[PDB]
Write a protein that binds this ligand. Structure first.
Ligand code: SF4
Ligand code: FES
Lengths: 96, 117, 114, 112, 72, 207
């Protein structure tokens, strides 16, 4: 930014765009360091009641699988899951 | 002479003068323990060995209670897990924070039972 | 007993393949010690070959023999289509290793191996 | 109308519905070789029957496609050819037969 | 023929200590191994610009039949 | 609902179960131990004598279109006769789904390849043969890909240790880069971690 008006004009004619508005370097366009000591929140699990773990066990709701056609233990044509819904173009720039 | 039990539906044959805990062992499900050691006498101080007894409302202590024919036991049920949660909250109320210093750091039955149950 | 075979049915077919492979290695070695500027003699190379063969002579299973054959063929491909180098090929001779003393007293005086 | 598909390795097919009738009729004519107690027949029969009904009920591709709800017509044709080959191969194999050889017991047991 | 065959044998490393006759049995009269035998047959094939399958190469455990084959 | 738990839905656990019954009744042979996991996945165990039939079926049959072999893998469990577990993770687009095929195998019991169908396996099979020791027929090029061109053994098993048997170093005495036996400096600490107290009373195993 410390540079000259004519050089600004020249580089801008060369490129095609503007640069003083979208520079890459950083002239006080940042957030100051030495930020203040913050205070934080907690989750919905820091209550005092109705927080019994048995409700939200998490890794005990798991249950082993449900086997089918083991070796010891009319109809329609089906699939593993419904098909894929075809996509559509965008509202902004579908071409390029 | 034998006696019958139906744990979680699963059936078991045992002797009299027996204990809920020795039955659950015969089956495999380990029951918690603080005041029990097969090579000692028995008491009911800790109060972490609690379970649920279908057809009867009140919980019991599986380190002292002798099993009565026909009882369906329930170990991992609601009342049991809640009893254990409360009991360990109580214990750890005052157990100081010397886990690091405590030479019994990685073998602490209480550490493990808190982390799990 | 009642099992499934691999590439063969008996020690004899296993051994005909093995002999083909011996022919390959024997007819090959010179090309190696001539392409990669080695030092050892063709005779020493063939000695190593026949030794690596003899050291699997307590074998009975055609499956084992055939897997060993497959691995030997892989290595032969690797060699003749030169990918292994001087190092890759001389890694056999234990050229930087004191022959493990089998003299019980040697083992005693030196270390703890029984 | 059109100029291309949107993929690579495909073609602007100008003779649809005809290749489709051909391929589906041939599938069924092969299925004729299959014992009725083979589920592959018992299923793909009706699948192809419904596909034929759909091509006959919709003559324009730009709607037949979205109706089949599968890929584009060329993908459909390719997949039908693939099912044809699959049939010719399951005919040499005897899958509908019972099981080959049950495994040992502690094989599918996880944990361990 | 036989002359250059016996010369090859005399040349071979661990063979021809005393005998390289035309009739001997390699694995029986000389008490040798299939590996060494294959070495012999490879030497012969390279002498004669010839090719052999391992099958008949092992069938020919007898110098007489060996020279019969190289004649054939 | 609770914040710290995913939703265990029904749509998938039902659709994939229907598809499992489907494939089972189609291939009463070359199949055993179908199953659906508690987390919306399908596994299909099969004899090694049905691999290519199963794969061709799943690639071609319209209702499956399991085209892309997203992965091929091995696993080793030594407490059984057939100790290796070969795994194929497959993907289909039209139906936006995945699937898992398993087949047991063993050292000294090779397998039938699939290169005719999914050319991706041409290299996963090389990996397998290099690392574990499982063999594949009808494979054009099968050679050590990852490890050295002279390496010997089968590392990704559970017996071939971590550190390995040999180390390398240069020895000016010969100027080469030779391989000598492992004499480490520090020892591989092995921390005993498995805690006794059972946490999962549902995956238990009685005597
Ligand atoms: S490790 Fe266990 S015994 Fe030691 S201080 Fe912690 S809770 Fe107490
Ligand atoms: S184990 Fe202590 S009260 Fe039962």
């Amino acid at each position: 930014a410390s540079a000259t008006r004519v050089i600004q004009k020249l580089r801008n004619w060369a490129s095609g765009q503007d640069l003083q508005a979208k520079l890459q370097l950083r002239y006080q366009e940042i957030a100051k360091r030495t930020q203040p000591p913050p205070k934080l929140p907690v989750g919905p699990s820091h209550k005092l009641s109705n927080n019994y773990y048995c409700t939200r066990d998490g890794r005990r709701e798991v249950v082993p699988p449900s086997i089918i056609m083991s070796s010891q233990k009319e109809k329609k044509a089906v699939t593993p899951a419904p098909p894929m819904k075809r996509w559509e173009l965008s509202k902004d720039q579908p071409y390029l | 002479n034998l006696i019958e039990v139906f744990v979680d539906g699963q059936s078991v044959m045992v002797e009299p003068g027996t204990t809920v805990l020795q039955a659950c062992e015969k089956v495999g499900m380990q029951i918690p323990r603080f005041c029990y050691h097969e090579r000692l006498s028995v008491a009911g101080n800790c109060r972490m060995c609690l379970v649920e007894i279908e057809k009867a409302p009140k919980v019991v202590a599986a380190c002292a209670m002798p099993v009565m024919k026909g009882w369906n036991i329930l170990t991992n049920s609601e009342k049991s897990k809640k009893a254990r949660e409360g009991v360990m909250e109580f214990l750890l109320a005052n157990h100081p924070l010397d886990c690091p210093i405590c030479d019994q750091g990685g073998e602490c039955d209480l550490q493990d039972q808190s982390m799990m149950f | 007993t009642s099992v499934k075979p691999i590439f063969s049915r008996d020690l004899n077919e296993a051994k005909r393949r093995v002999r083909e492979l011996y022919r390959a290695w024997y007819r090959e070695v010179p090309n190696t010690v001539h392409l990669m500027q080695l030092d050892i003699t063709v005779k020493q190379g063939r000695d190593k070959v026949r030794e690596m063969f003899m050291k699997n002579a307590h074998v009975t299973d055609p499956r084992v023999v055939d897997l060993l054959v497959i691995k030997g063929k892989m290595e032969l491909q690797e060699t003749i289509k030169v990918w292994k180098q001087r190092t890759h090929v001389m890694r056999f001779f234990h050229e930087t290793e004191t022959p493990r003393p089998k003299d019980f007293l040697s083992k005693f005086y030196m270390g703890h191996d029984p | 109308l059109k100029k291309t598909t949107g993929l690579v390795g495909l073609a602007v097919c100008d003779t649809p519905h005809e290749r489709l009738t051909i391929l589906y009729t041939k599938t069924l004519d092969i299925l004729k070789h299959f014992p009725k107690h083979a589920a592959y027949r018992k299923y793909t029969e009706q699948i192809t029957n419904e596909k034929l009904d759909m091509v006959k009920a919709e003559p324009d591709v730009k709607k037949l496609e979205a109706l089949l709800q599968g890929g584009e017509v060329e993908e459909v044709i390719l997949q039908a050819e693939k099912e044809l080959s699959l049939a010719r191969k399951m005919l040499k194999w005897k899958p509908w037969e019972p099981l080959v050889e049950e495994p040992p017991a502690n094989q599918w047991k996880w944990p361990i | 023929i036989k002359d250059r065959v016996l010369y090859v044998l005399k040349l071979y490393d661990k063979i021809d200590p005393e005998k390289l006759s035309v009739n001997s049995h390699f694995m029986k009269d000389l008490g040798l191994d299939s590996l060494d035998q294959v070495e012999i047959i490879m030497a012969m094939e390279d002498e004669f610009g010839f090719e052999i399958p391992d099958i008949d190469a092992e069938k020919l455990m007898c110098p007489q039949e060996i020279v019969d084959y190289i004649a054939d | 609902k609770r914040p710290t738990v995913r939703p265990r839905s029904d749509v998938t656990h039902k659709q994939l179960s229907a598809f499992g019954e489907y494939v089972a009744e189609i291939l009463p042979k070359y199949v055993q131990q179908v199953q659906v996991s508690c987390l919306d996945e399908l596994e299909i165990c099969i004899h090694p004598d049905g691999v290519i039939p199963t794969l061709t079926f799943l690639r071609d049959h319209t209702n499956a279109q399991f085209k892309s072999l997203a992965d091929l893998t091995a696993v080793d469990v030594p407490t059984r006769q057939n100790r290796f577990e070969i795994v194929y993770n497959l993907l289909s687009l039209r139906f936006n789904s995945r699937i898992r095929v398993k087949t047991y195998a063993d050292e000294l019991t090779p397998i039938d390849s699939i290169v005719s169908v999914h050319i991706a396996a041409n290299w996963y099979e090389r990996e397998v043969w290099d690392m574990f020791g499982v063999f594949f027929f009808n494979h054009p090029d099968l050679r050590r890909i990852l490890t050295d061109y002279g390496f010997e053994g089968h590392p990704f098993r559970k017996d071939f240790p971590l550190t390995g048997y040999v180390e390398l170093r240069y020895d000016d005495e010969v100027k080469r880069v030779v391989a000598e036996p492992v004499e480490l400096a520090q020892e591989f600490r092995k921390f005993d971690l498995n805690s006794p107290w059972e946490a999962f009373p549902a995956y238990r195993q009685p005597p």
